[PDB]
């Protein structure tokens, strides 16, 4: 990596290394009652909090916070789902504690057709043996995607994402010189990740029908 690239990675890692489930939440995962409604509530709190952590992490991505203070909204709005599912893949592969979180996820009003692809994606991520740098850079890349629905200035976003893609590529060559297609593999996983925008929207539909309540922030980002 060049020094500018090491600098970029060092700051992304400093911030990404601050992400961790709050203890009060962890405690609830262990002791709260077990029911569809309760499980949804626990998940809704973890999600609301994670959107807040994403906001902060994004605010630190270089150049981001100098973009049209609205094309910014397009990005966070557009990437929240993908970032959360990537984060969850990371945690289910690290581990149990998460053993319990899974049992709650499996009885939270999520239809079996979406449970299936969620756990298969986790297994597929587990397979790539990703490093923290890879999870951090991929999340940054997910957030800085130039294809979001409301992107006016797609070219500017493109400019800020490029350097990250470049850093990831070099990292893959450095830490897996004997697995040259690793990088391509990570990019393919980003593709499977995008299908969660649809899975998640179907989950929102089932939950709404089933009369669940979200959170002011989540209602905003997902238009409920």
């Amino acid at each position: 990596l060049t020094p500018d690239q090491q600098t970029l990675l060092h700051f992304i890692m400093d911030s990404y290394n601050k992400q961790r489930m709050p203890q009060e939440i962890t405690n609830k995962i262990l002791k709260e009652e077990f029911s569809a409604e309760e499980n949804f509530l626990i998940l809704t709190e973890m999600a609301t909090n994670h959107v807040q952590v994403l906001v902060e992490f994004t605010k630190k991505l270089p150049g981001f916070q100098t973009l049209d203070h609205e094309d910014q909204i397009a990005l966070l709005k557009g990437s929240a789902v993908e970032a959360m599912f990537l984060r969850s893949a990371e945690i289910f592969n690290k581990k149990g504690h998460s053993d319990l979180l899974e049992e709650r996820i499996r009885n939270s009003g999520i239809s079996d057709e979406y449970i299936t692809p969620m756990f298969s994606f986790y297994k597929s991520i587990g397979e790539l043996k990703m490093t923290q740098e890879e999870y951090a850079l991929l999340t940054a890349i997910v957030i800085l995607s130039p294809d979001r629905q409301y992107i006016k200035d797609r070219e500017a976003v493109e400019k800020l994402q490029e350097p990250l893609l470049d850093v990831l590529q070099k990292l893959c060559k450095i830490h897996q010189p004997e697995n040259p297609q690793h990088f391509a593999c990570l990019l393919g996983r980003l593709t499977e990740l995008r299908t969660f925008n649809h899975h998640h929207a179907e989950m929102l539909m089932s939950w709404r029908v089933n009369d669940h309540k979200f959170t002011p922030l989540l209602c905003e980002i997902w238009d409920v």
């Binding site: 807040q52 906001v55 605010k59 203070h69 609205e70 910014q72 909204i73 966070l76 709005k77 002011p216 922030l217 905003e220 980002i221």
Partner: peptide
């Protein structure tokens, strides 16, 4: 937006 809160915490 409209997405007041998101605009908010995005200081």
């Amino acid at each position: 937006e409209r997405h007041k809160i998101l605009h908010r915490l995005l200081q």
